[PDB]
Design a protein around this ligand. Structure first.
Ligand SMILES: Nc1ncnc2c1ncn2[C@@H]1O[C@H](COP(=O)(O)OP(=O)(O)CP(=O)(O)O)[C@@H](O)[C@H]1O
Lengths: 291, 8
């Protein structure tokens, strides 16, 4: 049978550029027959420079492969892959408002309500709960990796560091690597071990980013001081005028002992009454798959 | 930069 993810290049059109990505230019466009009962669909088109190395092309395609496993309202959806001809393309759900970090920055008085903030927290936690439930550790949860849809829905959108943990429940990084130090848990910084627990730590940082309108975590501290500050028990400050529920969630997500941190399901459970009505209809939390 | 070199 045919590769269900492969799409004929002819069915995809590129309307305009959105911005430069990790492996190449990302465009906004339209694709035909990628969604059921839908003639054409608006999409984001990620490309790989025709001059990219095998190493880069492999990483690019590996991210697409991982995404083929996800089907969640709060996770940016993979819609197809064009692996025949040049350039190599990956088509995904269009998130008109861009990444969450830029969206938060755009709200700065220089350049959101408690309910809006809690709604975002719930959506992100739901996507992460879905990910963890399928035995995947994201490893790079941060506002820059979440996206915002037209209707303001927030979704997990970059999986460059995502790893399958089905067999061992953890992932250990070996050797050297460029890692998101300011979003990493104490145990991860110490011995490169990543678990659903360290994903929860990063979620805490994302909450902080939301409440501060994307301030840089540990601003003023060099990477070195961050490593020491966090591993010794230090924490980011309490954002001014931050909703009590988010301060408490942060406190919980930042327990030094990973086993003391809540799970994404426990996080959602604690704030579910604050979520909008439709959350029960589209969330992984209230789905039958979660039992 | 958000990604810093670190070795284990
Ligand atoms: N699914 C999507 N929907 C809408 N716009 C998207 C999109 N994915 C990417 N974009 C746009 O393309 C730009 C570059 O995307 P990308 O996700 O590659 O950013 P990036 O360069 O930070 C990648 P990475 O985080 O892996 O380094 C984004 O800033 C955004 O404007």
């Amino acid at each position: 049978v045919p590769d269900e993810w492969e799409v004929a290049r002819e069915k995809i059109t590129m309307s305009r550029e959105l911005g430069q990505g990790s492996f190449g230019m990302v465009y906004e466009g339209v694709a035909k027959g990628v969604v059921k009962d839908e003639p054409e669909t608006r999409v984001a088109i990620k490309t790989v420079n025709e001059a990219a190395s095998m190493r880069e092309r492999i990483e690019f395609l590996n991210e697409a492969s991982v995404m083929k496993e996800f089907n969640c309202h709060h996770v940016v959806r993979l819609l197809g892959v064009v692996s025949q001809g040049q350039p190599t393309l990956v088509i995904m759900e269009l998130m008109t408002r861009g990444d969450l970090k830029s969206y938060l920055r755009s709200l700065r008085p220089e350049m959101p309500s408690l309910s809006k903030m809690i709604q975002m927290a719930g959506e992100i936690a739901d996507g992460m709960a879905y990910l963890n439930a399928n035995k995947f550790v994201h490893r790079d949860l941060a506002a820059r990796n979440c996206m915002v849809a037209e209707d303001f829905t927030v979704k997990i959108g970059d999986f460059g560091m995502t790893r399958d943990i089905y067999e061992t429940d953890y992932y250990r990084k070996g050797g050297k690597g460029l890692l998101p130090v300011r979003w990493m848990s104490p145990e991860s910084l110490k011995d490169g071990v990543f678990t659903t627990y360290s994903d929860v730590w990063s979620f805490g940082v994302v909450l902080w980013e939301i409440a501060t309108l994307a301030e840089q975590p540990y601003q003023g501290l060099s990477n070195e001081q961050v490593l020491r500050f966090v591993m010794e028990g230090g924490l980011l400050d309490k954002p001014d005028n931050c909703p009590d529920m988010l301060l408490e969630l942060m406190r919980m997500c930042w327990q030094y002992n990973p086993k003391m941190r809540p799970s994404f399901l426990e996080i959602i459970s604690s704030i579910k009454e604050e979520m909008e009505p439709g959350f029960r209809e589209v969330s992984f939390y209230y789905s039958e798959e979660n039992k | 930069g958000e990604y810093v070199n670190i070795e284990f």
